[model samples]
Target: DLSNVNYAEEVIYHIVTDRFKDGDPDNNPQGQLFSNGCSDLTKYCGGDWQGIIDEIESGYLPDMGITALWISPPVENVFDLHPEGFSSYHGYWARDFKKTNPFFGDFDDFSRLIETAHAHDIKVVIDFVPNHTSPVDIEDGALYDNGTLLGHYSTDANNYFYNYGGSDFSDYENSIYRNLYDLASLNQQHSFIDKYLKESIQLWLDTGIDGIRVDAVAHMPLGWQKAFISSVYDYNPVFTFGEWFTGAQGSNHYHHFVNNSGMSALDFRYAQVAQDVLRNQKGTMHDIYDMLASTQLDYERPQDQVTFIDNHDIDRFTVEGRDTRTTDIGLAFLLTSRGVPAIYYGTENYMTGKGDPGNRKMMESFDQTTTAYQVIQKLAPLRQENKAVAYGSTKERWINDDVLIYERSFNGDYLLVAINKNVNQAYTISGLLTEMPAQVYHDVLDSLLDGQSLAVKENGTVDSFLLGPGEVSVWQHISESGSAPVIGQVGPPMGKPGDAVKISGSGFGSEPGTVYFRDTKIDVLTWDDETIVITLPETLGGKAQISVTNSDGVTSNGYDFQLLTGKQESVRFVVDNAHTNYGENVYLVGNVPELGNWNPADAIGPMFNQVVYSYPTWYYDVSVPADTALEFKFIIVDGNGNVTWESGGNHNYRVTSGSTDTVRVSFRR
Candidate 1:
């Protein structure tokens, strides 16, 4: 039985530094301490824990189904006052871990923010940095916190940071034009440093943060990470993740971190694969599949991977000539794939930036009426309702040029998603029946097919359905027992050709009735407690449909189907010579019939050859005899080696070799 205690899905909304309010304007660095004040957008725009508290109190985020907030690091930033006109608004440049940055309000304000968020059932995940601190004084080389400074390289700090001091480190540098720079790495090996770090995290936990997101985890030694996590887990056993940022099979240093570091790592490999596939670059669906499959090699749980397409540091996914629709599809894949999905802020609104300042722009007001926002609202239920979607194994059912089909199953519930990336083509989904019955499952997005079921046949073939450009449909397959179906074997799409196609659907009893292919009765192959399989008749090819009539005479609506042409040879067309008499209704074509038709304004001939008649259905008469033997044939070429033949009505063709030959073809609607 459902209860009121059931909570909605947890969507984490990220708030960056200095974009909301100056909780303590009196402490404004410029007016109170330096030159420019909090008004400067680059240095600080007045965002503080109090501003976040105000956001929560305003019910803005809660109304949008956001159940968590990921805030920037709240530790004390460098007090060195960049009198040189530089600002550290990113919160990454820390001076002390034990104190909160006064530029961002006091520790009491942070506690109030955490308290207010918790009251709204919003969990907090604070950023934790263990990698390195900002450089010492640039010229004077005087460390700000001399007492807290573990040591310089000449001292004991060498044990904490990777030393590449004398080697130039050019190969390790990320950029060329800008020379490699160094920061003061922390000495986690120092017990004092370790305790200081652990205590800082514990203070936040005591403030009611639900989790921690370790930053630059790859730079931290594995032993230190393990010890640090052990110390934090002792306090709250918080749900934690690390930003490893390392690609798969490279150093795989992150793997050791995940396995031994006690927290999970962001799935950089999965993210890269998704970016490539969605961008339609050189990478294929297999690249994503292989990367996810490689997760099995690690002993860490698959759910440990924090899957995301783009984040704040990188260019927005839509900026790199990538379609936002495909990115949405990729987002759905990540949410449904085997991991915890983390959507970067503003992605739903298609936010983009070029670099540095652009990537770190303040969040803009999103148009609530957009389809993307509606889609996000539609998908939020999946995260709340199904544990599988939140944490489950992603099994690929079919991946091809037109479609990507996959499912997420955990415990018993399953979520099957079909994505149609091609804009101008339709995809036929089959082979999914091997795992579950082919039935009309509820379309989670549209909710049009709710309480109705489609049928899948035992032969592993389901009738083809059309998915529009960038359209994604998610269906929850329920079983005959009125329970959620367990995941069965996921197989590839069946490649076979037959006029009498077997179709299956769910919600059938032991003695099911006849099946129809667009009003024509098809032979029923078998009927079990859950599925009805039938053999479709031949005449149902292009525009054919499938529907079911039960023993009680209840008829279901006919779903459209595209008959597979089976194996056929495709013919290629080679354009030859072409010429036109200025203003004559001339049929300067190839070799065929003279049942010609024309529009004088267009000066085109009747459509001929094996071209799809649905297109304009003709070629221009002005451009003919411009080249030599206009070669044409109907034969399926590579990939699925299917052969094609001329239609029965247009059989015999007389060919005139190597000359300006005029032929006619019938124009039939």
Candidate 2:
């Protein structure tokens, strides 16, 4: 099943079938090709699976390193073209339930296309439409009518029929609560619609297709997509993605797919963020880093996301935001990052267009010489060669408004991917080098093209270099070449509040890297490639998993870091409130020594404010004890240092031995 497919090595290529290529010129047009939109846009063009098969048999995709290939729907569609002169060439609507439209080729041809692709190691995925049907006029039984009254499947019988009257969709901007197309939205809860949709999908999967792409899934009931997913999954688990279309990666909606149905999602969240950062240049690479960081932390498998710069849904990133540099940067990030990269057809050659019919230009010939194509060509295969680039942890070594240099480490290998977003302007970072062994490293992407190699100063510093526009450089340490890392001993065997723990080890990193401590992970305070120095929390008191993974991905065996308790067991307090004023600083006033001794003036520390899920809130985390009763009160310290005590009684908390306790003070203002 495609659901079980390893996406770490995947690079999806999405092609719009109506425009790709025409083969078997015999039955060119299934009917009149004329339409009301652009002369060549809305009208059905002669593109068939046979043409695609010709290319597959010719070995084009595999050479390009594409693992998954997605195409437009082949289901029979309504014959009526839109009054606006648009034809059903996009393949969304459906009139007949079975067989393919004679326009896009017959079922056998479609089946053969899938068969040929699978044989070439390319998986085939199809766009699916279970949201609604074409809005063609139903003079009477012009639909799936078992005669006007509606057959069985109906979550809401009346609404399931063709013309259940309701005002046109009102809020289209923010929510999926509104309807798409004038056609009726299906009541997925109904057995009739549910049964039909699942049966249709199973047929496609059984027909040799590898995966599915669900269209406008957010439009259906929230969890309803899962039911559809389970129906297909219970039968056969396939990789399915949905279009929630809530402008790239902000809301919790992304979780609806992966966590809900074991399905992946097209990363539209990145689409918006990328547009703002790369195209519009509204912010810096830090913003982009924030987004990726959130993703790395939140998603169980970030690579499951199908990352793309642009799709048939809208204008190309370059065209959408009006810049040649836009899509290029977006593509750069997509390729080097954790997610599964997907390139919209024609993106490689810098294809340009804006909103609809215009963006839907005829498929053009491939230009192997283009930079986007070249960058992708080099980067794509590199991911397959190294585990670091494919599925490792990430960190930004150096970043700024114009440039970003990041590191990836996994299984004794490492990669540094850098991109320059500025076109007319080149960038220079005085000293930026990967945190790995002190040796020579070369940009495989550039070196392959006869470019330059760099050396890491024995002190772990890199000489500066100027990066020109549209340039992407990928560097790696050749030959695992270093001695295997060894961890001889760890710490004082015990730690106190704000204690310095020395990690004596050989080959920790030929350069400075990470140190995994007890409760959390931290950067090495100082390391000479053999000795690591780290500072423990003022209130940390527990046994934590200790391990070290160096820059080259070489990791040391595990060790337990035992934390000693300071005299009066530690107690840290936290609180949340929206009305917290600017001049105010939250303090934990309690009986504990470090907690101001119940004095607002000697407050523990100011609680930090933040926003979570679009809500105003605040938080402050500190090392607390694992035993005894802790009495505390939340208070506010004025800008000028005046005490504003919380008007409530003392809050009592208990900390048991070997148990972590977080006492929440319900006061803030």
For 212-320, candidate 1 gives per-residue lDDT tens digits of: 7888765544434554564454345566778866654534455655653446667777777676667545456566667766774563455555667777665566654
- For candidate 2, write residues 1-669 as lDDT tens digits: 323334565688888887767766664654556432225687877666887887777766666667788898878766766666667778786654455766778888888898888888788888898876665332221335322334322233444433333335433212233346555455444445556666678778778877788887665543345435644544665666776676645466556344433356787766667767776677888878887787777655565567777788876666643554455556667777777777888887677787787777766775666666666777777666665666666888888887788888654567887777776677766778576668777776664322356677778788887766655667775334235454433433334445555564455766766767654676456776545776666443444556777777877766555453442222224575535567776666666533445666655555545311111344443333346455777776778888777775777776663322345545533
TM-score, each model? 0.62, 0.66
**TM-score of candidate 1 to 2 decimals:** 0.62
Candidate lDDT scores, in order, read 0.52, 0.62
> Which 10 residues in a row give candidate 2 its minimum summed lDDT?
610-619
The true-versus-predicted C-alpha distance at residue 380 of model 1, in Å, is 2.9
Name the runs in model 1 displaced over 4 angstroms: 1-10, 19-42, 80-86, 138-180, 248-250, 280-282, 296-299, 320-323, 437-439, 447-461, 477-669
CA-only RMSD, every prediction: 25.1, 13.8
**What's model 1's lDDT at 321?**
55
